[PDB]
Design an enzyme around this catalytic site. Structure first.
Site, PDB file in Angstrom:
ATOM      1  N   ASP A 193      -6.210  -4.041  -3.704  1.00  0.00           N
ATOM      2  CA  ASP A 193      -6.426  -5.276  -4.461  1.00  0.00           C
ATOM      3  C   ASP A 193      -7.835  -5.822  -4.205  1.00  0.00           C
ATOM      4  OD1 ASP A 193      -6.299  -7.735  -5.742  1.00  0.00           O
ATOM      5  OD2 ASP A 193      -4.808  -8.593  -4.396  1.00  0.00           O
ATOM      6  N   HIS A 349     -11.760  -8.276   3.896  1.00  0.00           N
ATOM      7  CA  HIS A 349     -12.396  -7.256   3.070  1.00  0.00           C
ATOM      8  C   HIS A 349     -13.899  -7.248   3.305  1.00  0.00           C
ATOM      9  CE1 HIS A 349      -9.667  -5.243   0.269  1.00  0.00           C
ATOM     10  NE2 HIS A 349      -8.940  -6.346   0.257  1.00  0.00           N
ATOM     11  N   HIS A 383      -8.497  -2.815   3.329  1.00  0.00           N
ATOM     12  CA  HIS A 383      -7.460  -1.879   3.785  1.00  0.00           C
ATOM     13  C   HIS A 383      -8.090  -0.488   3.890  1.00  0.00           C
ATOM     14  CE1 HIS A 383      -4.406  -4.931   3.032  1.00  0.00           C
ATOM     15  NE2 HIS A 383      -4.918  -5.101   1.825  1.00  0.00           N
ATOM     16  N   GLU A 408      -4.080   3.464  -0.136  1.00  0.00           N
ATOM     17  CA  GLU A 408      -3.234   2.524  -0.868  1.00  0.00           C
ATOM     18  C   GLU A 408      -2.889   3.066  -2.250  1.00  0.00           C
ATOM     19  OE1 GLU A 408      -4.016  -1.754  -0.801  1.00  0.00           O
ATOM     20  OE2 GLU A 408      -2.592  -2.044  -2.429  1.00  0.00           O
ATOM     21  N   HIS A 410      -0.535   1.443  -4.375  1.00  0.00           N
ATOM     22  CA  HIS A 410       0.285   0.324  -4.846  1.00  0.00           C
ATOM     23  C   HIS A 410       0.798   0.559  -6.265  1.00  0.00           C
ATOM     24  CE1 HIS A 410       0.738  -4.308  -4.135  1.00  0.00           C
ATOM     25  NE2 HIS A 410       1.840  -3.772  -4.630  1.00  0.00           N
ATOM     26  N   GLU A 453       0.476  -0.723   1.326  1.00  0.00           N
ATOM     27  CA  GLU A 453       1.197  -0.711   0.051  1.00  0.00           C
ATOM     28  C   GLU A 453       1.231   0.673  -0.611  1.00  0.00           C
ATOM     29  OE1 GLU A 453      -0.978  -4.259  -1.458  1.00  0.00           O
ATOM     30  OE2 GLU A 453       0.922  -5.351  -1.281  1.00  0.00           O
ATOM     31  N   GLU A 529       0.189  -9.599   6.718  1.00  0.00           N
ATOM     32  CA  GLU A 529      -0.332 -10.600   5.780  1.00  0.00           C
ATOM     33  C   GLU A 529       0.609 -11.794   5.692  1.00  0.00           C
ATOM     34  OE1 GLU A 529      -1.164  -8.644   2.008  1.00  0.00           O
ATOM     35  OE2 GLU A 529      -1.924  -6.879   3.066  1.00  0.00           O
ATOM     36  N   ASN A 589      -7.243  -7.040 -16.306  1.00  0.00           N
ATOM     37  CA  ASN A 589      -7.724  -7.657 -15.076  1.00  0.00           C
ATOM     38  C   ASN A 589      -6.688  -8.608 -14.483  1.00  0.00           C
ATOM     39  OD1 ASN A 589      -8.580 -10.689 -15.674  1.00  0.00           O
ATOM     40  ND2 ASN A 589      -9.185  -9.474 -17.467  1.00  0.00           N
ATOM     41  N   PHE A 593      -6.948 -13.832  -8.936  1.00  0.00           N
ATOM     42  CA  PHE A 593      -6.230 -13.268  -7.789  1.00  0.00           C
ATOM     43  C   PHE A 593      -7.122 -12.570  -6.759  1.00  0.00           C
ATOM     44  CE2 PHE A 593      -1.779 -14.162  -7.527  1.00  0.00           C
ATOM     45  CZ  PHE A 593      -1.411 -14.577  -8.803  1.00  0.00           C
ATOM     46  N   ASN A 596      -8.718 -15.285  -2.564  1.00  0.00           N
ATOM     47  CA  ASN A 596      -7.649 -15.717  -1.668  1.00  0.00           C
ATOM     48  C   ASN A 596      -8.188 -16.123  -0.302  1.00  0.00           C
ATOM     49  OD1 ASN A 596      -6.395 -12.530  -2.590  1.00  0.00           O
ATOM     50  ND2 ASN A 596      -6.055 -14.402  -3.796  1.00  0.00           N
TER      51      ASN A 596
HETATM   52 MG   LIG Z   1      -1.992  -3.856  -3.219  1.00  0.00          MG
HETATM   53 NA    NA Z   2      -5.726 -10.791  -4.064  1.00  0.00          NA
END
Ligand SMILES: [Mg+2]
Ligand code: NA
Ligand SMILES: [Mg+2]
Ligand SMILES: [Mg+2]
Ligand SMILES: [Mg+2]
Ligand code: NA
Ligand code: NA
Ligand code: NA
Ligand code: NA
Lengths: 1015, 210
Positions: A193, A349, A383, A408, A410, A453, A529, A589, A593, A596
């Site tokens: 993400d 990140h 990640h 990942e 996901h 994930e 998290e 998109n 999000f 954060n």
């Molecule tokens: Mg994810």
């Molecule tokens: Na996010």
């Protein structure tokens, strides 16, 4: 054969001709340089201006480019992501892959970055030894050419790829050609993400090693029961010709003092029927009373590994920082040096708003300083493995690190489709094994993670066991497949709540308290998290910390997350603004999000940061009588850089203060006896505030840094004094449209059609631009919105519930508007009903009492229909005509605080510029509330009562309608929102309702009262 | 000094409105010069014969949280039945009311008293929207108990068989009532969420003849 084999569409090919992974090398040829960690002449930076050309696909790259530079090419700084130079668009997608899910295939339109460099190589480098090139990060796959000849291929964007260039180079000028592909089979394992970017985004370097070289070394530290004795064990591997005269010396240094040394010839002990490793040696060094490493006190030694002849001629030296610490799980507790950790963690990140995913030392250091200044002791590499300097900095400043493999998936359906497939085991194994091989010597790394994930699959179990086998010194965790699988030593859920179960099929998120005690369960729990800090968030943060402190096996967690992933864009006038998903034409998109963070992308704090700092404090306080009990939550250090400042104030007016040095043992207590405080004559609440101050600067903080604080109410003297009787009496004047009240130079107008105070005059100057009206809504927070979309409604989201109930559409219907003259006052009584499609949502009943002193007392009683969704607020709003410079209040502050995020705020007299009363969240929403306020001052106006308020140049309507902060325009005058009651903001996650029941406005009947006067 | 506190009048005023009479009062409850509680009230009597009582109470933050915030009086009337719209039929308290059901309940007066062998506050019913007794009706959102025994007598009497019915009927109407606790009976056991710690309290009642 390069374009013919299509290695970027084969998960069976993750590299070609790539050298083995290993810990950071510099090939020093002087032992003193190795010890001091000074630059090595054998390690050259290729971080310079490179030549770059962009292509739509690899097939569009011309053959000449291998031999000769393209005139069309530009000159770009390296490291860089090419999206950040505008060559194509960055894509922000969360879960959904940015490409069609068709493993192992990628689109034929595959943006291709062609990098080239012409560079000098000295003859000395080519006469003897081995010259290699190191690419620390290439996203996502690349082919390498040297002087027109093919060298090799690499995948995994987040670990170094290294190639031997010895047989490719010439004396003088050489040319590297690197063809970087945006998409590859590697992308299927890189669905984090975050912004999807590409390029040579980490350092490029040339390393010269001797023919006979140190090829690997592992450092371990083992201890006796009380950590008063240690054995440092160093396994060293060589490549080249085996010889009887070869020796390895490992020496350990504390400053300029050598503390231990060991020398041995090569040849390990017998391990099986065929013998041992002739090319390996293990050195064992005794260390008495080792200085132990922790985040509290990051004691480090320097280990120098010398490869040399029996006679003492140096071949080469490598080195690393060594932290003596033991990490183990015992009896369900994660222990560091025998003591149970409490992880004050954050996910971080690698993000810069200008440079994208390129990390620099300055930004890394800024992050670490801010983290430690805000009481964080741990970071999760979310990640993927980080820039190598990150671990060194964590070693030295003292942060616990979770090092996480770049895996990942996901977006797969189900999430384990690839990770349960043995055909993807090779690609996965490399991302895990090469991470461990690189970072295993860093003391800061205390836990390995298998990625993020990617469900739970058999490949996780295999790699879990691989790590346990090769490195028993660190626990392995992994959250996928329900956070408590056979592939994790630690129960590590994401967004599990404190008390509330979320019993999802197959992957339930149990209450963290409940999870610990499930039948058969014994592991520690640390949230990988939690407390999703998206926009106006971190409501209920205190609940986590209360649970962490109460329950031994609840050992903390990592906040999501450190920094907003916003990117800088420029408008027509060249002015910078913060952009999120979709702002680059990227589609599909996931919009805002990507933001954060506890801090903005430029590292300015969100208000939530102070709540984190406060809840993560290392000193706990209790008050009993005149005694303050201070308890230390440090596991290793004494409070040797700490004094307690105390202050007693009556309604913000200082009465007494003082300071007491803290002398608290780790886990210890200290009693501080406050001196007898003189009784105040006047009425009001006494408040005691304590602050822990660090008198001395540290490596991470300035002198006078405040590390902890707490407040208590002391004695309260309730005012029983009757206000002096007024000489004058307000005069009521009536027309069909208005009730008007006059007293001296003051006038109040109540519109008889609307039933609201429509205007107020002082002298003869209007005070209002819009009438004073009830408000039951707020411009929706990110938490109110969740994942709802215009096209796809999530009916569960708070914003959608309020919309469906007609909360934003409801119009005030007047039921009653009367005026009465009293002995010394005029009394206005009103009743309103808010209805939507024949349903009464709210009833507001008010009295306004204007007396001879000029004060207006407003009494409000609100009914809320039990079957309507609980309203966001119960308050009043108006647009004041005045724009004043300062806002002065007696209440909680100085920063933005909400009912479920106010523990960090302190009750006192605060005075801020109007601009500070607005929080510039990139996605605009309700913001800047201050709670527990007894008095608010703005221009000539004073409001008294017990209320929450915000005050700004932006209406709730504008905040609601505008998607980006840079598009907001200051309105005429000042919008004031005064709430008797305000809903919680939540934040346990930002995709389902997360406001706890106790913070929902569900009482049905509400009462509040305000006095409005002129001062 | 909660049991000893004396009311000191701060304000008592009367106003005529277009259709009603408004009485405003303020009292301070004090002990040894310390103000424990301030009660601010309005009584609004209109043409329908309804008396609307608004009560706003301040509780000093440094006084122990009070057992209740309400009104009481000894009514002249002794009636046979008690009728209420609220939680029942049995005695229920804020931390012991889950078994109680909201409905229209009608019991003899004697059932509104719980004969605990050691007498105490007893017989409260919570979440009551309407109460009827003899000629009286009270409406609002309150907790109440009603009996022939004053709180004073219950406090002073160690055994139930020694209680005597007093003249008329004692009515306690609470905007708010503290939990009863019971996790144990040798240390304070009333949970924080059931202690009257908010500092400022508001309730309103309508008293009329029905
Ligand atoms: Mg994810
Ligand atoms: Na996010
Ligand atoms: Mg491949
Ligand atoms: Mg506090
Ligand atoms: Mg029930
Ligand atoms: Na704990
Ligand atoms: Na100290
Ligand atoms: Na908005
Ligand atoms: Na008794």
């Amino acid at each position: 054969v390069v374009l013919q084999r299509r290695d970027w569409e084969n998960p069976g090919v993750t590299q070609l001709n790539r050298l083995a992974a290993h810990p950071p090398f510099a090939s020093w040829r002087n032992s003193e340089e190795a010890r001091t960690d000074r630059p090595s002449q054998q390690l050259r930076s290729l971080n310079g201006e490179w030549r770059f050309a962009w292509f739509p696909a690899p097939e569009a790259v011309p053959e000449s480019w291998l031999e000769c530079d393209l005139p069309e090419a530009d000159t770009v700084v390296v490291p860089s992501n090419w999206q950040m130079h505008g060559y194509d668009a960055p894509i922000y997608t969360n879960v959904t892959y940015p490409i069609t899910v068709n493993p192992p295939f990628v689109p034929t339109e595959n943006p291709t970055g062609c990098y080239s460099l012409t560079f000098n190589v000295d003859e000395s480098w080519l006469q003897e030894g081995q010259t290699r090139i190191i690419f620390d990060g290439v996203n996502s796959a690349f082919h390498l050419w040297c002087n027109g000849r093919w060298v090799g291929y690499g995948q995994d964007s987040r670990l170094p790829s290294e190639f031997d260039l010895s047989a490719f180079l010439r004396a003088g000028e050489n040319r590297l050609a690197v063809m970087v592909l945006r998409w590859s089979d590697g992308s299927y394992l890189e669905d984090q993400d975050m912004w999807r970017m590409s390029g040579i985004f980490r350092d490029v370097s040339l390393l010269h090693k001797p023919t006979t070289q140190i090829s690997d070394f592992h450092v371990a530290t083992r201890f006796n029961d009380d950590f008063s004795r240690a054995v440092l064990e160093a396994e060293v591997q060589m490549c080249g010709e085996l010889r009887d005269y070869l020796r390895v010396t490992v020496s350990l240094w504390q400053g300029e003092t050598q503390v231990a040394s060991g020398t041995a010839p090569f040849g390990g002990e017998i391990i099986d029927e065929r013998g041992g490793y002739a090319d390996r040696v293990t050195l064992r060094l005794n260390v008495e009373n080792p200085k132990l490493w922790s985040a509290e006190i990051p004691n480090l030694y320097r280990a120098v590994v010398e490869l040399h002849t029996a006679d003492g001629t140096l071949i080469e030296a490598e080195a690393c920082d060594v932290g003596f610490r033991e990490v183990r799980i015992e009896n369900g507790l994660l222990l560091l040096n025998g003591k149970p950790l409490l992880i004050r963690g954050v996910n971080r990140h690698e993000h810069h708003p200008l440079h994208g995913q390129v990390m620099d030392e300055q930004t890394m250091v800024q992050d670490i300083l801010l983290m430690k200044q805000n009481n964080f002791n741990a970071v999760r590499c979310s990640h993927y493995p980080n820039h190598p300097l990150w671990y060194t900095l964590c070693d030295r400043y003292g942060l616990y690190v979770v090092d996480e493999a770049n895996i990942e998936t996901h977006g797969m359906v189900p999430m384990n489709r690839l990770t349960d497939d043995p055909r993807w085991l090779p690609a996965m194994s490399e991302r895990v094994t090469r991470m461990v091989q690189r970072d295993r010597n860093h003391p800061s790394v205390i836990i390995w993670s298998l990625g993020n994930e990617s469900g739970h699959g058999a490949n996780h179990d295999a790699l879990y066991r691989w790590i346990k086998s090769v490195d028993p010194s660190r626990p392995v965790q992994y959250e996928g497949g329900g956070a408590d699988t056979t592939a994790t030593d630690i129960i590590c859920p994401m967004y599990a709540r404190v008390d509330e179960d979320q019993p999802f099929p197959a992957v339930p998120k149990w209450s963290i308290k409940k999870w610990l005690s499930l039948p058969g369960e014994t592991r520690p729990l640390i949230l990988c998290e939690y407390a999703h800090a998206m926009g106006n968030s971190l409501g209920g943060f205190a609940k986590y910390w209360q649970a962490f402190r109460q329950y031994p096996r609840l050992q903390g967690g990592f906040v999501w997350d450190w920094v907003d992933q916003s990117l800088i864009k420029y408008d027509e006038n060249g002015n910078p603004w913060s952009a999120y998903g979709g702002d680059f034409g990227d589609t599909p998109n996931d919009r805002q999000f990507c933001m954060n963070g506890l801090v903005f992308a430029d590292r300015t704090p969100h208000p939530a940061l102070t709540e984190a700092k406060h809840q993560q404090q290392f000193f706990q306080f209790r008050l009993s009588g005149q005694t303050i009990e201070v308890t230390s939550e440090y596991l290793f250090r004494h409070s040797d850089n700490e004094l307690l400042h105390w202050m007693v104030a009556l309604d913000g007016k200082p009465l007494a203060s003082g300071e007491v040095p803290l002398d608290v043992a780790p886990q210890g207590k200290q009693l501080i006896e406050l001196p007898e405080l003189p009784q105040p004559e006047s009425a009001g609440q006494l408040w005691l505030t304590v602050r822990v101050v660090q008198p001395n600067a540290t490596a991470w903080s300035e002198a006078g840094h405040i590390s902890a604080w707490q407040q208590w109410r002391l004695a309260e003297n309730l005012s029983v004094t009757l206000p002096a009787a007024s000489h004058a009496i307000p005069h009521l004047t009536t027309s069909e449209m208005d009730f008007c009240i006059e007293l001296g130079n003051k006038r109040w107008q109540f519109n008889r059609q609307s039933g609201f105070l429509s205007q107020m005059w002082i002298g003869d100057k209007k005070q209002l631009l819009t009438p004073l009206r009830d408000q039951f809504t707020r411009a929706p927070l990110d938490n109110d919105i969740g994942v709802t979309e215009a096209t796809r409604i999530d009916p569960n989201a708070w914003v959608e519930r309020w919309k469906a109930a007609g909360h934003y559409q409801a119009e005030a219907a007047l039921l009653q508007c009367t005026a009465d003259t009293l002995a010394d006052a005029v009394l206005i009584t009103t009743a309103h009903a808010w209805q939507h499609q024949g349903k009464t949502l709210f009833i507001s009943r008010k009295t306004y009492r204007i007396d001879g002193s000029g004060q207006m007392a407003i009494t409000v009683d609100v009914e809320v229909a039990s079957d309507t969704p609980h309203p966001a607020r119960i308050g009043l709003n108006c647009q004041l005509a005045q724009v004043a410079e300062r806002v002065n209040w007696l209440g909680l502050g100085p920063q933005e605080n909400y009912p479920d995020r106010l523990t960090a705020a302190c009750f006192d007299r605060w005075d801020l510029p109007l601009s500070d009363m607005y929080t510039p969240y990139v996605f605009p929403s309700e913001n800047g509330l201050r709670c527990g306020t007894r008095e608010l001052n703005y221009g000539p106006h004073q409001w008294r009562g017990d209320f929450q308020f915000n005050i700004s140049r932006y209406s709730q309507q504008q905040l609601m309608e505008t998607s980006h902060r840079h598009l907001l325009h200051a309105e005429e005058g000042t919008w004031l929102n005064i709430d008797g009651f305000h809903m919680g903001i939540g934040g346990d996650d930002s995709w389902s309702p997360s406001v706890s029941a106790e913070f929902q406005l569900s009482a049905g009947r509400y009462h509040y009262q305000l006095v409005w006067c002129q001062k």
